[PDB]
């Protein structure tokens, strides 16, 4: 027994060579600010861990975003706070402005700088081809930066990308599931969102890395260019791998679980069957064809692979022809 060990092709050892208290989040002492600085205006959204409100700072009066965190193990709270702070300042990363607490119930809240996003859904419906290229590039800037700082997001999806389309401003948000990369470490396969879960999570392969994020980024791209959301629409975690297998083919999947000697769930055996690798051109139709080019399809194909190690790194992705036209405009 023993599944084959794996390691990230890039930034494998960034954490090894940093002082522990960069990655030792349990030991991070939180410096609390004054809650009465912030007063709530409206509810923005909510979710499995938090409730989110727009608010106003009364010191100087400008808007903020307050992510109020529901009871979890203090461990998880420190993890997010450390990562938010480690990455703060970095390109397209959300700026944590302050941390505050309800003295009584001691309910902790994160205060972020305001991001004025655009009907994101109602935005896509008319994103253009250049727009998808442009925004995809900006995600990659964040993804490369956070990977370079030794962190994997582990929950890349459209809800976690804020777009101020008016100001062509993007920000990779919600690091409540992000974690530090340590080579050799077995991680929790219960992360992401069932439509954005990489094959490695679906087969219970635990020694994953930054590449998980690139699979998710693939699932986003596929969704935007083909105009099908979500792209892999599984009914449960098992079915999710079937939906992927129906596109990528069951060949490369059994090759993948052999290459890494992964004990498959006996239940996967009984639903996967035998499927051919479908050509990406096959999902192209009249509604989407204006977003599909050969470079788009090549790029997507180099992102959505069972073998996490054969997926592009975020830096490599940025080098693809798909972004040539973007990088040129960004050469001002």
């Amino acid at each position: 027994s023993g599944p084959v060990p794996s390691r990230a092709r890039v930034y494998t050892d960034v954490n090894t060579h940093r002082p522990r208290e960069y990655w030792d989040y349990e030991s991070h002492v939180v410096e609390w600010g004054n809650q009465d600085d912030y007063q709530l205006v409206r509810k923005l959204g909510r979710g499995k861990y938090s409730e989110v409100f727009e608010a106003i700072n009364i010191t100087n009066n400008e808007k903020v975003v307050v992510k109020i965190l529901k009871p979890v193990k203090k461990k998880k709270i420190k993890r997010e706070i450390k990562i938010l702070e480690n990455l703060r300042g970095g390109p397209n990363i959300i700026t944590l402005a302050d941390i505050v607490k309800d003295p009584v119930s001691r309910t902790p809240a994160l205060v972020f700088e305001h991001v004025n996003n655009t009907d994101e859904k109602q935005l896509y419906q008319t994103l253009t081809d250049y727009d998808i290229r442009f925004y995809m590039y900006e995600i990659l800037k964040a993804l490369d930066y956070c990977h370079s700082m030794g962190i994997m997001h582990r929950d890349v999806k459209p809800h976690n990308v804020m777009i101020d389309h008016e100001h062509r401003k993007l920000r990779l948000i919600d690091w409540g599931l992000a974690e530090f990369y340590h080579p050799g470490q077995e991680y929790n396969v219960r992360v992401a969102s069932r439509y954005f879960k990489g094959p490695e999570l679906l087969v219970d392969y635990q020694m994953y890395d930054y590449s998980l994020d690139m699979w998710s980024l693939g699932c986003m791209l596929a969704s935007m260019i083909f105009r099908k959301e979500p792209f892999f629409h599984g009914h449960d975690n098992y079915d999710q791998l079937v939906r992927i297998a129906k596109v990528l083919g069951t060949e490369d999947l059994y090759d993948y679980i052999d290459k890494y000697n992964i004990e498959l769930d006996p239940r996967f055996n009984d639903i996967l069957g035998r499927h051919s690798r479908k050509r990406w051109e096959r999902f192209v139709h009249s509604e989407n064809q204006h977003l599909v080019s050969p470079e788009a399809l090549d790029f997507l194909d180099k992102l959505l692979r069972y073998d996490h190690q054969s997926r592009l790194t975020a830096r490599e992705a940025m080098e693809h022809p798909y972004f040539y036209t973007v990088v040129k405009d960004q050469a001002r």
Partner: protein, 199 residues
């Protein structure tokens, strides 16, 4: 046995009423103008004062009884504006006969009876808290049939004009809405009200 006034004020629901002195009623001057407001004034007054009635008509006797109750009520409204009325009502207030303010931050301040209108028929009796200075509906439903006009719009205002020492301090504390510790900014309400208005 007991007197008409004593009986009436003793009835269930009439807990807010005090007993008017016979002197006050027997003095015609105090009831000036009331004959133009109650049917069967002559006979109604006679009943109130426990005097010889005139009994063959079993429904006429109930019609007089209503008029007696209406007249008593209207007399009451005048009576409690006078020094002695106030004196009696003040006694009842110091016992809490009128109930207590439901506002949390009023801390059970004893209230006083008040009429929203002086015209009979228009509204039932309400309660006036002298701390928050607002007006409440009585909690118990037995008080939901006593006409407000039998107490009047000016009673509590007079009482504190006459005994200003009884006026309680304004509430030391106020309600502060917090969600997870955060206060709610007042912009949150325009916003909300729009969502109702837009709706």
């Amino acid at each position: 046995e007991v007197s008409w006034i004593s009986w009436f004020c003793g009835l269930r629901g009439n807990e807010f009423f005090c007993e008017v002195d016979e002197d006050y009623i027997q003095d015609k001057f105090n009831l000036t103008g009331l004959n133009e407001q109650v049917p069967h004034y002559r006979q109604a007054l006679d009943m109130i004062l426990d005097l010889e009635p005139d009994e063959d008509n079993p429904n006429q006797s109930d019609l007089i009884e209503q008029a007696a109750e209406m007249l008593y009520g209207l007399i009451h409204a005048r009576y409690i504006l006078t020094n002695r009325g106030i004196a009696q009502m003040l006694e009842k207030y110091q016992q809490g006969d009128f109930g207590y303010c439901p506002r949390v931050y009023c801390e059970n301040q004893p209230m006083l009876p008040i009429g929203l209108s002086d015209i009979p028929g228009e509204a039932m009796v309400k309660l006036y808290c002298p701390k928050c200075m607002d007006v409440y509906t009585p909690k118990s439903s037995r008080h939901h049939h006593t006409d407000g006009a039998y107490f009047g719009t000016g009673f509590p205002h007079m009482l504190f004009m006459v005994h200003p020492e009884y006026r309680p301090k304004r509430p030391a504390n106020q309600f502060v809405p917090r969600l997870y510790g955060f206060k709610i900014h007042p912009m949150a309400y325009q916003l909300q009200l729009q969502a109702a208005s837009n709706f």
